[PDB]
Amino acid sequence: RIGEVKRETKETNVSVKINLDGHGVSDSSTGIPFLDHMLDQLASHGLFDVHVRATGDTHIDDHHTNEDVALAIGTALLKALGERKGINRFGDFTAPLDEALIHVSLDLSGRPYLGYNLEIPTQRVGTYDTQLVEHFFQSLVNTSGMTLHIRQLAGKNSHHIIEATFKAFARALRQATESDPRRGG
Amino acid sequence: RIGEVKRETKETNVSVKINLDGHGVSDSSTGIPFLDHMLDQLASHGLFDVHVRATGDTHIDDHHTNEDVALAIGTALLKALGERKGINRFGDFTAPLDEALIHVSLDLSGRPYLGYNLEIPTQRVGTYDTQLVEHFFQSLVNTSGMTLHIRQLAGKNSHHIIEATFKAFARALRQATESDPRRGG
Amino acid sequence: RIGEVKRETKETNVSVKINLDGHGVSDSSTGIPFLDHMLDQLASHGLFDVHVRATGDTHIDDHHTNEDVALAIGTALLKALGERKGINRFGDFTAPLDEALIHVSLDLSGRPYLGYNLEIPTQRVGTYDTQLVEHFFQSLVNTSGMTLHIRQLAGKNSHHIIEATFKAFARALRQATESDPRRGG
Amino acid sequence: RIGEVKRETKETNVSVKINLDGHGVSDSSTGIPFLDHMLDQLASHGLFDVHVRATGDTHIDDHHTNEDVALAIGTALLKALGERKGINRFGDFTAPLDEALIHVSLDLSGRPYLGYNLEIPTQRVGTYDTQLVEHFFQSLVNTSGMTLHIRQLAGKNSHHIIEATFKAFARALRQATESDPRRGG
Amino acid sequence: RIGEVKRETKETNVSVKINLDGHGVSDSSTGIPFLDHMLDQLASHGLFDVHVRATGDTHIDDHHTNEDVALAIGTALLKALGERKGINRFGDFTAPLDEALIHVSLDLSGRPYLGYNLEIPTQRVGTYDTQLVEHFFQSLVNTSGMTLHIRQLAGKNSHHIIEATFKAFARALRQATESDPRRGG
Amino acid sequence: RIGEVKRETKETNVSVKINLDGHGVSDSSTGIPFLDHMLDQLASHGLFDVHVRATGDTHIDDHHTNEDVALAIGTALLKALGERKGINRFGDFTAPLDEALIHVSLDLSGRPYLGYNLEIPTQRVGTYDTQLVEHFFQSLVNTSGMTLHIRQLAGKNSHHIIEATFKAFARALRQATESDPRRGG
Ligand SMILES: O=P(O)(O)C[C@H](O)Cn1cncn1
Ligand SMILES: O=P(O)(O)C[C@H](O)Cn1cncn1
Ligand SMILES: O=P(O)(O)C[C@H](O)Cn1cncn1
Ligand SMILES: O=P(O)(O)C[C@H](O)Cn1cncn1
Ligand SMILES: O=P(O)(O)C[C@H](O)Cn1cncn1
Ligand SMILES: O=P(O)(O)C[C@H](O)Cn1cncn1
Ligand SMILES: [Mn+2]
Ligand SMILES: [Mn+2]
Ligand SMILES: [Mn+2]
Ligand SMILES: [Mn+2]
Ligand SMILES: [Mn+2]
Ligand SMILES: [Mn+2]
Ligand SMILES: [Mn+2]
Numbered sequence A, B, C, D, E, F: 001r002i003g004e005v006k007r008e009t010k011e012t013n014v015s016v017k018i019n020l021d022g023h024g025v026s027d028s029s030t031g032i033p034f035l036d037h038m039l040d041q042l043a044s045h046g047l048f049d050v051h052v053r054a055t056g057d058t059h060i061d062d063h064h065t066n067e068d069v070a071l072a073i074g075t076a077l078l079k080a081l082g083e084r085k086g087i088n089r090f091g092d093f094t095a096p097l098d099e100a101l102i103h104v105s106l107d108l109s110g111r112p113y114l115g116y117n118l119e120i121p122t123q124r125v126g127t128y129d130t131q132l133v134e135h136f137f138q139s140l141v142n143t144s145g146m147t148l149h150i151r152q153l154a155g156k157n158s159h160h161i162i163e164a165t166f167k168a169f170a171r172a173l174r175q176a177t178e179s180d181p182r183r184g185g
């Protein structure tokens, strides 16, 4: 079960491929290094094999090369799934880091939606603009065709809240499409 | 594992049977057609085989023929279970529709309770009186002997909130009694 | 410039075709008659030729046969456009009815968004559920791939506010894609 | 998989052993009888085999013999686990009693934390000082090395809230370390 | 219709030329790269041919080399126009990006004014100081001799609000001076 | 009295050694230079001999290489102490910088706790993320096994508040364990 999408514009050049049924292998180098620590989380905890290579204009702000990565993961994930048959289709999970809880629920059925209730106190994490985290999941929703609710329940630390939502999105994505129920189709 | 209850009063005539271990088959025609769309949800997502035939006085308000359907599903579900042995007994699940989250938790152990926190903005959905949804689960609780907490977390659409709680009740009922733990009894 | 989409599920059967460059001709019969008065407005004021034939389950609530009409207009409108070249791409317009102003702005470039600020006082217009008007434009946005801002500026009348936003959406859709600028491509 | 810890000070004398992979057997007599009803819950619902023998100074307040029990369960649970390999590592669960919901989430990875949001109305349950329940889980966190979030969602009954958090901690501890994912190590 | 202004002080060295009647060609390299992405917008959407070469002291803050660019565009734009005859003279436009609306209105008649109602949440975009955007249009107003009202109507994203006002200023500047009415002079 | 801890993970490589009874000598180079100015303060004012060598991934945010330094100082400090005998065990001190008072109290007896009441106005000091100062003392508490209360009493300057708490922690750590009372053991 693999979907691979290449996509190149005048701003970015994005190469994306995902094995949906796989192991904790990860090779994914974007132009900004903080996404590389977050795409490790949906490889080791979601047990996906994700491969991202993106070259973009970080000479200017990082908004352009974060859209085109997140848009390409969704088109690869819509192409990874087929005619949706024999999957659980519902993924819900909550995951603590230190002091912080995120609850992530998702639907993976045609219709795109993003509910976003996180509030990050600081404006940069290391060098990541921190207003792009909602824009990562907004771009992932619009091409994958999924409903997604992300809710913060506790916690005040910028590196801890963003890493609690990428562990909880990974565990709730391998519960929806990766696992299978008792029915056949 | 089947329980079947017939029940007839001067107002209604209700025939109800449930296969608790079954597939996504559904034949259930009540006097009001909007329940028929909701009992489809606890057949396809709960993987139950539910059979409801009710004839009642919809010449007057629909309050009378909604009690006697919901009372008969519970007596059939108490008769579907036996001496409760080797079941998980706890069912919790949250399920998104577009913009709306419902969290449903349940207990299935003797004691009846209903906590209800939904707030529906409109007063009719198509023709369904919308004040009967809490009364559906109040009648189902009192005969099944279960604790039930239903909590709205987001969402403003009458057809979306009621369909998000009948998908989440179904997935949380096939987690409590249908699945079995590692112990035998 | 024509796009035609047929779409049939277990609930509805929808046939939709749009001439984007056309005249004020209109033949469009949905299962609910109040949409037929509103699709007249995007034919005579938008100068589109829209043809809708939908058969659906109005035996239950009208939510199901309003999605599948609005989803099919968008896929027809994405197929009416091609590689977007030589269009204005921006459509903004405000249109009064009696006492009521709606301001509609749109983008037609890939990314879907809906901003909705209307507040209708009553719950039915004639028989139309009135909570579906936002759901009409939510379904039209997700398949057409357009940003859409709809803002109420004045007015308290249910038939006047909904008819002021379907005149202003029509005039702002024939300004974006139908008219052409001085450039060639 | 067994860890056994003996620990004796001038105040208490505590003997603690836990089979982490086991059945619903329970023999655990502390000096105060209300802990004995609560350690039954993490034996039958968590499917652990816990053995506690503690003799302490209940001639004075029960604060001293509740620390040393809860400190010894954690050191036994850190010794029950080894090099943490091939476990789910995340345990989240919510469990109703009558009218009361507790949501318990946990992490079991090195770092200790306790978030506590319960509010018990009365000051004694039978004879248990009721300000020690947070101190039970504070002592269990500091030696086990786990993050733990405990959140009350409803309910006003002292015996019902404390028994809803010891059923939900047990089900969320046999989900984190007891169950195993599809990966090997 | 071309105006070209060279201007050099002890701090900056600015070379600016604008073809007002032209096409979507753009070669404009300032010392800070985020202006280069914004001056692309008034070339492709305004259909102007703008040429900016500025060398300045970005060894210190960027306030000095943003004034002298914006002051030189206005003197070039006052020299691009002549005795104002046969132009529309009024330019108003609103332009959505994702979630954000800016309404820009302008006058181009002698008298300088700037109304500014934007509120940007963050303090840097990539490396641009974000308090200079109002100072860009304040310097452009004082030399061009135009009234300018900029009003935010929605939106919370720093890169989206600033790019929605440079698309709407461009479309409202090619409506005022570039297009011509039915009168001759 | 020396404890030395080496610790290496996939992210960092930390070498830490502390002479608890020593002089004002300091050689400690972490990957981020602002910790090096703060570990000078617990060498000259605490009269400790601390040696830290850490190599970590400052290619991404500094959160990872600040945990593993602070975790290694605590394990070295627990190994510096032995069976705690003949020490004062209580350390309390308040220390002014310009306009700012911090009161630091500590316990060094088994049980870990951190109370943190500082509020820093800015978000970076030079390049240090400033949300990590509480996370420094949270990691130092969990491995050393000490209670620690840090309270701000006055002051508004980011470099002055953080340097007032590292002078007051040093003087309160050489009062607890370094000095000895009149008793022998
Ligand atoms: O969760 P872990 O312990 O497996 C490693 C984390 O990814 C690193 N971390 C520590 N604090 C925040 N992130
Ligand atoms: O959830 P689906 O997409 O399987 C079909 C829904 O039952 C129909 N629906 C669409 N909006 C509200 N209900
Ligand atoms: O706008 P008109 O006058 O062309 C006809 C309207 O469509 C009918 N109407 C009158 N009030 C509300 N709608
Ligand atoms: O939950 P049960 O019914 O298995 C027995 C309970 O432990 C006893 N109880 C009844 N109310 C509060 N506790
Ligand atoms: O508006 P577009 O899609 O033509 C390209 C934008 O300029 C890039 N962008 C995407 N988000 C914010 N800016
Ligand atoms: O406290 P001092 O004067 O010994 C030197 C300080 O460490 C340097 N300093 C001056 N302001 C803030 N820090
Ligand atoms: Mn964007
Ligand atoms: Mn991390
Ligand atoms: Mn009743
Ligand atoms: Mn439905
Ligand atoms: Mn819908
Ligand atoms: Mn009308
Ligand atoms: Mn205590």
Ligand SMILES: [Mn+2]
Binding pocket: D037, D159, D163
């Ligand atoms: Mn009890």
Ligand SMILES: [Mn+2]
Binding pocket: E063, E067, E135
């Ligand atoms: Mn200035």
Ligand SMILES: [Mn+2]
Binding pocket: A064, E037, E159, E163
């Ligand atoms: Mn841009």
Ligand SMILES: [Mn+2]
Binding pocket: A098, A160, F063, F067, F135
């Ligand atoms: Mn951390």
Ligand SMILES: [Mn+2]
Binding pocket: F037, F159, F163
């Ligand atoms: Mn200093």
